[PDB]
Coordinates of C-alpha atoms and ligand atoms in Angstrom, one line a residue:
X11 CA -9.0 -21.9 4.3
X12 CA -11.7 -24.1 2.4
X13 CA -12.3 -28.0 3.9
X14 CA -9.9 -30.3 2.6
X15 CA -11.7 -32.5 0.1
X16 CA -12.3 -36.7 0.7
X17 CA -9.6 -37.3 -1.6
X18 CA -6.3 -35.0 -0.8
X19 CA -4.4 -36.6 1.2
X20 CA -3.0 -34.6 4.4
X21 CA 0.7 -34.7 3.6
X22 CA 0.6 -32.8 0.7
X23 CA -1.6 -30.0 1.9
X24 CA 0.5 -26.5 1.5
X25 CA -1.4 -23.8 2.3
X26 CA 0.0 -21.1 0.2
X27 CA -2.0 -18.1 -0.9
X28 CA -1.1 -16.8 -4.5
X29 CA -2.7 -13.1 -3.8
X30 CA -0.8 -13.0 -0.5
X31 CA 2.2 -15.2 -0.1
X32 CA 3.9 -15.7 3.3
X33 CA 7.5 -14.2 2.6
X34 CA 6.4 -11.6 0.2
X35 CA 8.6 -9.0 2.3
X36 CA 11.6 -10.6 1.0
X37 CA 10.3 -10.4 -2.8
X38 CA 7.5 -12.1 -5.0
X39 CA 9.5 -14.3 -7.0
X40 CA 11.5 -15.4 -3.2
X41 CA 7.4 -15.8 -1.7
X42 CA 6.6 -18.3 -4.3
X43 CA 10.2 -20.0 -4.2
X44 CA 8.9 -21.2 -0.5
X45 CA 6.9 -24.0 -3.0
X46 CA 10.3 -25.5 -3.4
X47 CA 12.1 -26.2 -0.5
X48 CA 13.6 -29.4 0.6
X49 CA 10.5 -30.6 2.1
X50 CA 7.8 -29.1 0.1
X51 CA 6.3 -32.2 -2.2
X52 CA 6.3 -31.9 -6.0
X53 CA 2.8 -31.2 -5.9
X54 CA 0.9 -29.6 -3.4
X55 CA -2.7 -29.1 -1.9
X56 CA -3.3 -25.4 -1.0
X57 CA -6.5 -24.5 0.8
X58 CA -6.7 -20.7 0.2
X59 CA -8.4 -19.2 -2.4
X60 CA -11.4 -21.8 -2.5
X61 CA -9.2 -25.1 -2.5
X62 CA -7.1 -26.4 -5.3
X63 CA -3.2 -27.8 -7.0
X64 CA 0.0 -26.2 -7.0
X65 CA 2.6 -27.9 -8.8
X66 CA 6.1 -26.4 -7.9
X67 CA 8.3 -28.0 -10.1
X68 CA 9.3 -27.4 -14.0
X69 CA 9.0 -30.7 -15.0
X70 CA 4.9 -30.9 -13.6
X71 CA 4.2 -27.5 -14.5
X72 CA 5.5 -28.1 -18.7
X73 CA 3.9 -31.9 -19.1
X74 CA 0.3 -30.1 -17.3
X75 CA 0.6 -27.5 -19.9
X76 CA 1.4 -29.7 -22.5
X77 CA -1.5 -32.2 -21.7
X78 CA -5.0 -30.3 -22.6
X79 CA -6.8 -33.4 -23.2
X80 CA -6.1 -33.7 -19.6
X81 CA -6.2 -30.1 -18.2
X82 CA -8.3 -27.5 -19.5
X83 CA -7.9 -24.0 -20.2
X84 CA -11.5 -23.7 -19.8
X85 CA -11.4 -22.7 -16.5
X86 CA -8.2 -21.3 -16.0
X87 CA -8.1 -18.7 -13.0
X88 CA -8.3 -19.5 -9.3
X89 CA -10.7 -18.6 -7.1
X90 CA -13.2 -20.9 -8.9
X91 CA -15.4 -18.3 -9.8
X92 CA -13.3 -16.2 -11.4
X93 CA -12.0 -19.5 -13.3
X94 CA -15.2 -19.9 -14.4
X95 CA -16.5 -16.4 -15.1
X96 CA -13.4 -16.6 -17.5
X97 CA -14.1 -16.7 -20.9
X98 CA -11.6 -14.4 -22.9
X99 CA -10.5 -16.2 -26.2
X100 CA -8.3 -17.8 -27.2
X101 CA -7.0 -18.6 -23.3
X102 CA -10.4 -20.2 -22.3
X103 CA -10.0 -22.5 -25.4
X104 CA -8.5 -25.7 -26.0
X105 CA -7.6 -27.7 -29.5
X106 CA -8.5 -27.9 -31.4
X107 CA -11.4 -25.4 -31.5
X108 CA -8.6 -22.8 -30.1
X109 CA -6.3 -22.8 -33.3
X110 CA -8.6 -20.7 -35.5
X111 CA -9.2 -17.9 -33.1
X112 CA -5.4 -18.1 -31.8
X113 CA -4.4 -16.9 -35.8
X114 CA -6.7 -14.1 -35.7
X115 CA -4.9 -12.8 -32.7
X116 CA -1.5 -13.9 -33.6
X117 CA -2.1 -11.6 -36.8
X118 CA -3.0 -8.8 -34.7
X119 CA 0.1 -9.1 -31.9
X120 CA 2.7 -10.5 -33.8
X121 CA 6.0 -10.2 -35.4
X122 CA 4.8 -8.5 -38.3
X123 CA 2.7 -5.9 -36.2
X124 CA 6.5 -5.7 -33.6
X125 CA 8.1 -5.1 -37.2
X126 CA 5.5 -2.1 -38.3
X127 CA 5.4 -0.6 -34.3
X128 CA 9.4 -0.8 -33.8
X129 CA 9.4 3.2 -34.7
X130 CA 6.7 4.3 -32.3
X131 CA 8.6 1.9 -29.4
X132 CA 11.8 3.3 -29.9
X133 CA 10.4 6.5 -30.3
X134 CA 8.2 7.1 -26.8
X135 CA 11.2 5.1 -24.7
X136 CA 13.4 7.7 -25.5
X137 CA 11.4 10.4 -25.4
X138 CA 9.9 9.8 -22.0
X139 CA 13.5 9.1 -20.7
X140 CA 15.1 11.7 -22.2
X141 CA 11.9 13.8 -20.4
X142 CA 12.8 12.6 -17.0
X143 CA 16.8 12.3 -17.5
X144 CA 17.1 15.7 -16.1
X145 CA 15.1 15.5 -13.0
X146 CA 17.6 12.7 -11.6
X147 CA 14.7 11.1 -9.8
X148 CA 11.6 9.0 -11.0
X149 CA 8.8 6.9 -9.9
X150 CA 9.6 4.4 -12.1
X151 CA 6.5 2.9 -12.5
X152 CA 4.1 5.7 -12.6
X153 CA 6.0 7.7 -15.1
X154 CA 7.6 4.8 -17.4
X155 CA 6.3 1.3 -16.8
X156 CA 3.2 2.1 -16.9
X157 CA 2.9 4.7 -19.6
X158 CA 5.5 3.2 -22.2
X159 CA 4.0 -0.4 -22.9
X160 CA 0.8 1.0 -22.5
X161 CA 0.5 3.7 -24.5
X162 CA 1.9 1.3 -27.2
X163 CA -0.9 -0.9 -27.2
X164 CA -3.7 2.0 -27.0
X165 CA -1.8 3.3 -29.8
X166 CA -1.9 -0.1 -31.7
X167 CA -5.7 -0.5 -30.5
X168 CA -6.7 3.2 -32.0
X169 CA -8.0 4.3 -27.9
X170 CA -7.5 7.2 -26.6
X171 CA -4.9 7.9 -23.7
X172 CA -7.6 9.4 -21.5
X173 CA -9.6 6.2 -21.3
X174 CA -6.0 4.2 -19.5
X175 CA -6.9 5.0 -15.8
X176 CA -10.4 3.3 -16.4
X177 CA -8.6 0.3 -18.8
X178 CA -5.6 -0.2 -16.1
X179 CA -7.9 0.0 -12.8
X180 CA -10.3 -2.7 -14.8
X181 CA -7.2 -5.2 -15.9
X182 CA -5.4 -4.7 -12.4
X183 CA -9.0 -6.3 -10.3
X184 CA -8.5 -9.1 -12.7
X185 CA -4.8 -9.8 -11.6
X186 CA -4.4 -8.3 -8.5
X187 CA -8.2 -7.7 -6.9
X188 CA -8.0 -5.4 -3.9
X189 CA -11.6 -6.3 -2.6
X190 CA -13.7 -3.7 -4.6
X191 CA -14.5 -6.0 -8.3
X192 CA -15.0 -9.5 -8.6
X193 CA -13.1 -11.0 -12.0
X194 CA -16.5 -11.7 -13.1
X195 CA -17.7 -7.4 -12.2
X196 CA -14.4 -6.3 -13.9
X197 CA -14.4 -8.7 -17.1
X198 CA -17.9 -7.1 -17.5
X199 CA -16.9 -3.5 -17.3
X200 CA -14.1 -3.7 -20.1
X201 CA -16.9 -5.7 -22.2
X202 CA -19.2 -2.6 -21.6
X203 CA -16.4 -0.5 -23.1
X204 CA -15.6 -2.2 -26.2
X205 CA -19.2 -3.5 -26.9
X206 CA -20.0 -0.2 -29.2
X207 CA -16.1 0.6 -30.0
X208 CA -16.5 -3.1 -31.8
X209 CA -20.1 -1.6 -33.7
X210 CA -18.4 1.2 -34.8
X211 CA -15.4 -0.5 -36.3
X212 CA -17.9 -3.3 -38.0
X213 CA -19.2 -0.5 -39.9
X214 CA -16.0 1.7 -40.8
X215 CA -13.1 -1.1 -40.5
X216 CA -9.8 0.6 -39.9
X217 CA -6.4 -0.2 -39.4
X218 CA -6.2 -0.8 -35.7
X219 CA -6.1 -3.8 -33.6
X220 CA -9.8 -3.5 -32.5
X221 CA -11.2 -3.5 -36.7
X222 CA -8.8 -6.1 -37.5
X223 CA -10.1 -8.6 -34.7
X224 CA -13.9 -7.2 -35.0
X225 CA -13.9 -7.9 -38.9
X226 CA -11.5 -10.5 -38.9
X227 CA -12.5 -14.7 -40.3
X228 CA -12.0 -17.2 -38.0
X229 CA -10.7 -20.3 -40.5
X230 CA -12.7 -18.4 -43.3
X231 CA -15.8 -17.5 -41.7
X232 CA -16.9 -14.1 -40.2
X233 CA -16.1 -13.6 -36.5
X234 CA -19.0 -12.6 -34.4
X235 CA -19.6 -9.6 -32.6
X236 CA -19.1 -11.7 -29.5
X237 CA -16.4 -13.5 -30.0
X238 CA -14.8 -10.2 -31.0
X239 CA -15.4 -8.5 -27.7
X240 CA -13.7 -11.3 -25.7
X241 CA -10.9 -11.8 -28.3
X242 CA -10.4 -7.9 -27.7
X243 CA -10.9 -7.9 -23.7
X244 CA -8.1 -10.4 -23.4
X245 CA -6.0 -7.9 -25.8
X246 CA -6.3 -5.6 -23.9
X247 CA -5.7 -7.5 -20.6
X248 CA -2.6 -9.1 -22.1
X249 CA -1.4 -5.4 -23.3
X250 CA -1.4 -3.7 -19.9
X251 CA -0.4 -5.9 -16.8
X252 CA 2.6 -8.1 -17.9
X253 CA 5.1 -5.7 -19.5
X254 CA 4.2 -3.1 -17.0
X255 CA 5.1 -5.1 -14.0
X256 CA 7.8 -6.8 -15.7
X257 CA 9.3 -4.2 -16.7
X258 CA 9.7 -2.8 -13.2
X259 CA 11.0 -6.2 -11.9
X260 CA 13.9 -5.4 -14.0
X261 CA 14.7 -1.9 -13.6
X262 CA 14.4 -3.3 -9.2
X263 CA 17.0 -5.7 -9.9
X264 CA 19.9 -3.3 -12.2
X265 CA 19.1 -0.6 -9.7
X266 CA 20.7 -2.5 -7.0
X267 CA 23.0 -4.6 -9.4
X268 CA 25.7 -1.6 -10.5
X269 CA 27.9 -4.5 -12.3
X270 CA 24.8 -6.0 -14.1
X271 CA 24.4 -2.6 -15.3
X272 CA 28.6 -2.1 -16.1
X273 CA 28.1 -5.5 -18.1
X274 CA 25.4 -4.2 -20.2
X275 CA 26.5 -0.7 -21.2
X276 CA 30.1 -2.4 -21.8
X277 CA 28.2 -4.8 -24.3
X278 CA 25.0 -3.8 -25.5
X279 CA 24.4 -6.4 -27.8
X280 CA 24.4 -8.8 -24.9
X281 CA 20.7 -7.2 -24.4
X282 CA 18.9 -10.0 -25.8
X283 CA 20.3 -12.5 -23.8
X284 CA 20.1 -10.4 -20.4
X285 CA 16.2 -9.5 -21.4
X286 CA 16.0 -13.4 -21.0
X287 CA 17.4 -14.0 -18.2
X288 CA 15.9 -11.5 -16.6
X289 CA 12.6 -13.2 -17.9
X290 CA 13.7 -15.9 -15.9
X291 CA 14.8 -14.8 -12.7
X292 CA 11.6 -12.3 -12.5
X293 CA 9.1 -14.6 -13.9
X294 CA 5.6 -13.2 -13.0
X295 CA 2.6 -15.0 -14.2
X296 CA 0.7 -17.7 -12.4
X297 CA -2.7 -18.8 -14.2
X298 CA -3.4 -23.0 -14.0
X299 CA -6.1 -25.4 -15.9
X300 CA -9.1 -27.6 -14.7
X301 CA -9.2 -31.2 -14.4
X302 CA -11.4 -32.7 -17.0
X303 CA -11.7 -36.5 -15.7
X304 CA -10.4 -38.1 -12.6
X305 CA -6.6 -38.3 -13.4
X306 CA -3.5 -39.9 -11.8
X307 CA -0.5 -37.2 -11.8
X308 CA 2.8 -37.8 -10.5
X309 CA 1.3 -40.4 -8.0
X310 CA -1.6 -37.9 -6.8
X311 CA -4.7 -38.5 -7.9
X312 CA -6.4 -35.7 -9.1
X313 CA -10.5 -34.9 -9.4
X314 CA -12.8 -34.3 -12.0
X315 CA -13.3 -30.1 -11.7
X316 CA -10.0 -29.9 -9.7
X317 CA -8.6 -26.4 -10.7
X318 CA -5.0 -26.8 -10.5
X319 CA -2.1 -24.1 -10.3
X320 CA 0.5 -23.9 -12.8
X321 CA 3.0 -21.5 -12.3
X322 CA 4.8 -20.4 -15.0
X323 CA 6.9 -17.9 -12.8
X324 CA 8.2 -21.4 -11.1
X325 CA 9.8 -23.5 -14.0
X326 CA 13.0 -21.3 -14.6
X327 CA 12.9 -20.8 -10.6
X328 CA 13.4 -24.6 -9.7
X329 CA 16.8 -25.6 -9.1
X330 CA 16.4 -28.6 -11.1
X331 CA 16.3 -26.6 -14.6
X332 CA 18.6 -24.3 -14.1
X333 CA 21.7 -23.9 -11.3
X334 CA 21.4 -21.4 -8.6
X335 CA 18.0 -20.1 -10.0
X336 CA 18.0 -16.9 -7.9
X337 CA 21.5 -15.7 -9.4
X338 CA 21.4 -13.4 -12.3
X339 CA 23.2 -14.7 -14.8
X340 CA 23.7 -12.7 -18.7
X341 CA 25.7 -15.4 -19.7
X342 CA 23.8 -18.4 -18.4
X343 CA 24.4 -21.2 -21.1
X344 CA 20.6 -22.8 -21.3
X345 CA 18.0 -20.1 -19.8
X346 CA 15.4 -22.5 -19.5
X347 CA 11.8 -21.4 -18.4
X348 CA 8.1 -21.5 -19.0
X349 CA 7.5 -17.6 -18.9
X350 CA 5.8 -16.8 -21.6
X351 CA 3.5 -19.8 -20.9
X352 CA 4.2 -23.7 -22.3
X353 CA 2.4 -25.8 -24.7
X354 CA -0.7 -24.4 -27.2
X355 CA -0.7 -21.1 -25.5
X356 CA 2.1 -19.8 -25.6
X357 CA 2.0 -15.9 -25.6
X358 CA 1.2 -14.5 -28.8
X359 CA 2.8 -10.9 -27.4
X360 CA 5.9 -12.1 -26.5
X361 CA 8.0 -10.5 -29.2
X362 CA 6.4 -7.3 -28.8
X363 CA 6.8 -7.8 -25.0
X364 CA 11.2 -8.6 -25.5
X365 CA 11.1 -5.4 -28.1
X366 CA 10.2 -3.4 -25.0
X367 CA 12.4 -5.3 -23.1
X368 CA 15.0 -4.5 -25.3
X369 CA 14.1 -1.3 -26.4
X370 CA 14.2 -0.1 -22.5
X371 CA 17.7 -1.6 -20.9
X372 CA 19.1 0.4 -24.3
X373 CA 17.7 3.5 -24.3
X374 CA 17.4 3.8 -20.5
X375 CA 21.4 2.6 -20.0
X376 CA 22.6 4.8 -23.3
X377 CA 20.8 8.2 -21.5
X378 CA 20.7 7.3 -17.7
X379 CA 23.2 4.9 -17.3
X380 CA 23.6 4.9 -13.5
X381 CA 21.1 4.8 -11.1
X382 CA 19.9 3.1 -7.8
X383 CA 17.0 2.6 -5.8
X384 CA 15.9 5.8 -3.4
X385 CA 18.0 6.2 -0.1
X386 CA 15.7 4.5 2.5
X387 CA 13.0 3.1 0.0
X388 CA 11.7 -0.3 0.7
X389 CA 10.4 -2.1 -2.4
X390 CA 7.2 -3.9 -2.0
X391 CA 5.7 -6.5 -3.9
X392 CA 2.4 -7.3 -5.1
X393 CA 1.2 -11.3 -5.5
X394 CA -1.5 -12.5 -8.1
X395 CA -2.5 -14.0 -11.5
X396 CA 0.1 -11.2 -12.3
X397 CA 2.9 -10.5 -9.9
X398 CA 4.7 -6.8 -9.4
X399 CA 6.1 -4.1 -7.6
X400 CA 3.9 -1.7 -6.0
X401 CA 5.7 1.4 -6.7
X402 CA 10.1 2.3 -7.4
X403 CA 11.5 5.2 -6.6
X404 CA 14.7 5.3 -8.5
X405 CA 17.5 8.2 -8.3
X406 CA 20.6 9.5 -10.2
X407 CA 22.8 12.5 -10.6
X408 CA 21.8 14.4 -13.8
X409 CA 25.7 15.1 -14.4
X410 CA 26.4 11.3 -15.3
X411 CA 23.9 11.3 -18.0
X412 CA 23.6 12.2 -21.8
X413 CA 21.1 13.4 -24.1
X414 CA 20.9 11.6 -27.6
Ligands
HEM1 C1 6.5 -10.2 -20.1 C2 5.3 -10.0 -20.7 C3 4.4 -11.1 -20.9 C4 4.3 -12.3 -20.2 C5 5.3 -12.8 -19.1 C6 3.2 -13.1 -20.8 C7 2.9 -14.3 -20.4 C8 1.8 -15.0 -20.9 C9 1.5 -16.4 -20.5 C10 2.2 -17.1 -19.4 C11 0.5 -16.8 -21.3 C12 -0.3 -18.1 -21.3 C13 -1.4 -18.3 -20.2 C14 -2.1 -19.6 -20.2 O1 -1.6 -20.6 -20.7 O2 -3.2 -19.6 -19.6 C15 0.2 -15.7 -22.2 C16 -0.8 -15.7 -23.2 C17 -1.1 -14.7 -24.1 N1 -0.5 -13.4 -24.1 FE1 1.1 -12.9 -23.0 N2 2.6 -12.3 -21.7 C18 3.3 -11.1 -21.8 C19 2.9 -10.1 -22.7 C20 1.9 -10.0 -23.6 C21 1.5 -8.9 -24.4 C22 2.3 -7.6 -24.4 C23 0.4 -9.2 -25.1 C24 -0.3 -8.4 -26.1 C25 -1.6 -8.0 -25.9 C26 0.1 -10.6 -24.7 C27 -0.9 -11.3 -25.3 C28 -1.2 -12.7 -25.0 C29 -2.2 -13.5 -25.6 C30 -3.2 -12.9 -26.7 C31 -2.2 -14.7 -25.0 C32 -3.1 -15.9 -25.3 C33 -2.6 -17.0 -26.1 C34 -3.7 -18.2 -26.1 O3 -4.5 -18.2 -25.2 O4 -3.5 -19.0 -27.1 N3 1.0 -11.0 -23.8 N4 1.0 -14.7 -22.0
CAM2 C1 -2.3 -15.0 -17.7 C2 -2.2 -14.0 -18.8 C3 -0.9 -13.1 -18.8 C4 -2.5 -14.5 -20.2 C5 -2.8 -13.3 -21.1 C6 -3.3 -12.3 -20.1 C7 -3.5 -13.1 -18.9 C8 -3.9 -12.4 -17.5 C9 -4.7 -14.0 -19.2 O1 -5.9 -13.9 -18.9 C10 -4.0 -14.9 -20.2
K3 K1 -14.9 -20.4 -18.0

């Protein structure tokens, strides 16, 4: 716990810890729902982690996200240091100097790109479900939440699957640090890595993610080597924590849900609209901004250099923007959430991200269609920039399943 600053007043000060939350036990998404209790204020001082905002409500957490002229993405991770190590593009960036950069990567990531990789997606979920189908038992994310959205974007970045362990061990300090890197140590090390990959592809430009960034024009003039290593580094980051975890939040959830599951192999094209609820209910990102003036908010007045917490996980959590936030609802009429991010930074991989999404409640449900959590497991989850799920082991009987 870090001294409470001169100006933050002691009824607000909620000292929550975003890398270790207080009822994580009962689930990640449950830990940070503590931020909205009856008594909890709309906006909150929390003392861990160096000092520093938490809004907990929707309505705070969009108009922040909304108002860059306000809060900054320049420094965008808590603790402070890692906020300011930070300098990936385009996330460390605001308008307008973001937009041009923001392009370059939308071209690599986008719709287009989802449109040219939807073989290869398809093709490796059903292929590594189909490979474990048989064995009517898995560690769910060792041997597919990791592996499928990862070796998707190591196949759309032209690296080789040996180099993942080095790649997931680097992103994972930066979400979920167990002690051994800084942000700063780890943000280095994947640097180190593509510095010469980047040389390479200057030279011989290629058809991968990696050339198309490295040679890439940034409104029309040539990107540098530079700013194509931190374009790149936030690639990869973006690639290899989010769907991964996410993906196991999901699979938790419709292994102990058996008529969640029913209502999907019943009506498959209600997929889509389960993928985003389920974005909803297991909402796992939490990265925030820095105050660039001294700033009245919501009746709180806020610091020049105040890093504050904006958690997109909490918007389609709060009671107030959507009814009983912690039910699962396929149907729900207006899914509202922030969490794919809110305002000039919105993810630029969230339709490859749903396409997984997708791809995986089908394929998994048409080939394995019942399953449930181990007899006696305990699933634990992990609290950070990222949230997930440390580890799920998942069983069925082989004889309820198909091959296709
Ligand atoms: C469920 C999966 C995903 C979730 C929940 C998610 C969430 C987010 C959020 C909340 C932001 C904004 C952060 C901020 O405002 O500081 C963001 C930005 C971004 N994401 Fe995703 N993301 C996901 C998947 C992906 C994937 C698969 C990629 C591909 C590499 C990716 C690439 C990016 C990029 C490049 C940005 C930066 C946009 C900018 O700064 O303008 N994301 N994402
Ligand atoms: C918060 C994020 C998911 C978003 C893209 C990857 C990530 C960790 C960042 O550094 C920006
Ligand atoms: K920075």
């Amino acid at each position: 716990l870090a001294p409470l600053p001169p100006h933050v007043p002691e009824h607000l000060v909620f000292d929550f810890d975003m890398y270790n939350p207080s009822n994580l036990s009962a689930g990640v998404q449950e830990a940070w729902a503590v931020l909205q209790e009856s008594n909890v204020p709309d906006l909150v001082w929390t003392r861990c982690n160096g000092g520093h905002w938490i809004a907990t409500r929707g309505q705070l957490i969009r108009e922040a996200y909304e108002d860059y002229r306000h809060f900054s993405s320049e420094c965008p991770f808590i603790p402070r240091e890692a906020g300011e190590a930070y300098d990936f593009i385009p996330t460390s960036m605001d308008p307008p100097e973001q937009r041009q950069f923001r392009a370059l990567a939308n071209q690599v990531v986008g719709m287009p790109v989802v449109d040219k990789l939807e073989n290869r997606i398809q093709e490796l979920a059903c292929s590594l479900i189909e490979s474990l189908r048989p064995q009517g038992q898995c560690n769910f994310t060792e041997d597919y939440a990791e592996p499928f959205p990862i070796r998707i974007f190591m196949l759309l970045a032209g690296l080789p699957e040996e180099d993942i362990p080095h790649l997931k061990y680097l992103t994972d300090q930066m979400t979920r640090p167990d002690g051994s890197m800084t942000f700063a140590e780890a943000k280095e090390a994947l640097y180190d890595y593509l510095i010469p990959i980047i040389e390479q592809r200057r030279q011989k430009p290629g058809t991968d993610a990696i050339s198309i960034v490295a040679n890439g024009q940034v409104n029309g003039r040539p990107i540098t080597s530079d700013e194509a290593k931190r374009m790149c580094g936030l690639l990869l980051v973006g690639g290899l924590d989010t769907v991964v975890n996410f993906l196991s939040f999901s699979m938790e959830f419709l292994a102990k849900s058996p008529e969640h599951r029913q209502e999907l192999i019943q009506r498959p094209e209600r997929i889509p609209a389960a993928c985003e609820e389920l974005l909803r209910r297991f909402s796992l990102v939490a990265d925030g901004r820095i105050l660039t003036s001294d700033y009245e908010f919501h009746g709180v007045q806020l610091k020049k250099g105040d890093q504050i917490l904006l958690p997109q996980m909490l918007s389609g959590l709060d009671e107030r923007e959507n009814a009983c936030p912690m039910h699962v609802d396929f149907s729900r009429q207006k899914v509202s959430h922030t969490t794919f991010g809110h305002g000039s930074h919105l993810c630029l991989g969230q339709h490859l991200a749903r396409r997984e999404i997708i791809v995986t409640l089908k394929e998994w449900l048409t080939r394995i269609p019942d399953f449930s959590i181990a007899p006696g497991a305990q699933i634990q989850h992990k609290s950070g920039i990222v949230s997930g799920v440390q580890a799920l082991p998942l069983v069925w009987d082989p004889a309820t399943t198909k091959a296709v």
